[PDB]
Design a binder for this molecule. Structure first.
Ligand code: C5P
Length: 379
């Protein structure tokens, strides 16, 4: 029959990983592909090279009904190769299962490849610390069965349910942190349950690509020559990393912008609590979804080189263009950054802190008192 590959992610990290998958399998120009990556626009010059390449919008963390129109274009027997965001897996696959129900004779799920949204999955797991994990797993598999058979969603534990897909399909999990699963003792039952169905995100994949594929990849993630050259300068560098929010909208978005600018000053100003030194060239790597928050930094800071917000930080690691130091608000990017390059990681207020616990458990931060940006004086 025929295999159809779907790349779905409303966030950044899973999409970054999925674009690598696309690059590795980019030779086949006719393999049907459906892209549902909210934060990525595949360049037109690349699209034209492929046939049976489709695009679908995501709304409320699930592909829209426009997905059914695409699938109807393949009348034969089709096996779905689905790539998903782990945190949002249940909703992202919802429309796919609904379609399958109506075309049970020709539509089947071939396999699932799941990738971490980022720190979110770990913060969520951290909250399950006092649960009987072994029992939570059994209940989740049961409720997953109910979802697969009735199409209805009802999970007593939405978090653990994200990890019981193997009970229904061939699966492969790609974790931002395999250490968390080994260091969090309360999760031992889960680690054992997952058996050989997981691996850590492979950040060395880019280096294994051919010279042609690496350029294909760089084009997909937006890493142009101008940015590359700005990072090839000879001088110690410091990249300030931004964050974003979705809380209280406007008011909170403006609070975030102001606290982030103040944070930057604490790193770059001689009188700052986190002053890095004067020999560093300053760069700003804003959050992909920072929006007005990123603009606030550029409009109110000086002598700072902007690295387009849409360019995922990990790309610098892949290209071997990491700076000497990195500092900013807690982010998923710090999970794969070499410890020697960490300046300071600051946490946001606006409510024990689950995120703090996760990074401490992984040794990303030490036992010392954590810095929340609401405790930094206005410079
Ligand atoms: N300042 C930032 C913040 C996040 N990011 C990318 O977005 C992802 C998720 O980041 P957050 O955990 O900060 O939301 C990361 O894995 C990183 O790829 C970035 O490239 N630059």
């Amino acid at each position: 029959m025929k295999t159809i590959t779907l790349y779905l992610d409303p966030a950044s990290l899973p999409a970054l990983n999925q674009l690598m998958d696309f690059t590795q399998n980019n030779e086949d120009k006719t393999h049907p592909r459906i892209f549902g990556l909210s934060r990525f626009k595949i360049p037109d010059n690349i699209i034209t090279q492929y046939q049976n390449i489709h695009f679908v919008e995501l709304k409320d963390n699930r592909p829209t009904e426009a997905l059914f129109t695409i699938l109807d274009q393949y009348p034969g027997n089709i096996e779905l190769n689905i790539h998903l965001n782990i945190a949002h897996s249940v909703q992202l696959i919802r429309p796919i299962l609904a379609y399958r129900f109506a075309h049970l004779d020709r539509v089947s799920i071939q396999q699932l490849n799941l990738y971490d949204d980022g720190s979110m999955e770990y913060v969520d797991l951290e909250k399950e610390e006092n649960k009987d994990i072994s029992a939570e797993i059994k209940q989740a598999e049961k409720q997953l069965s109910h979802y697969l058979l009735t199409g209805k969603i009802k999970f007593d534990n939405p978090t653990i349910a994200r990890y019981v897909w193997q009970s229904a399909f061939p699966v492969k999990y790609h974790f931002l942190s395999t250490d968390y699963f080994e260091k969090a003792e309360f999760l031992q039952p889960l680690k054992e349950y997952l058996a050989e169905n997981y691996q850590k995100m492979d950040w060395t994949a880019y280096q294994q690509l051919t010279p042609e594929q690496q350029a294909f990849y760089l084009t997909l993630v937006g890493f142009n020559d101008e940015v590359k050259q700005s990072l090839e300068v000879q001088q110690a560098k410091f990249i300030f990393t931004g964050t974003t929010t979705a809380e209280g909208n406007t008011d909170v978005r403006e609070y975030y912008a102001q606290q982030q600018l103040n944070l930057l000053n604490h790193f770059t100003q001689a009188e700052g609590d986190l002053f890095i030194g004067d020999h560093y060239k300053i760069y700003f790597k804003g959050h992909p979804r920072g929006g007005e928050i990123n603009d606030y930094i550029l409009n109110n800071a000086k002598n700072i080189t902007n690295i387009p917000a849409n360019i995922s930080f990990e790309v610098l690691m892949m290209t071997g263009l990491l700076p000497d130091k990195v500092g900013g608000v807690a982010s998923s990017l710090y999970f794969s950054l070499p410890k020697e390059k960490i300046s300071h990681i600051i946490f946001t207020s606006n409510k024990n802190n689950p995120y703090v616990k996760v990074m401490r458990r992984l040794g990303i931060i030490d036992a010392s008192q954590v810095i929340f940006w609401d405790s930094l004086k206005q410079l």
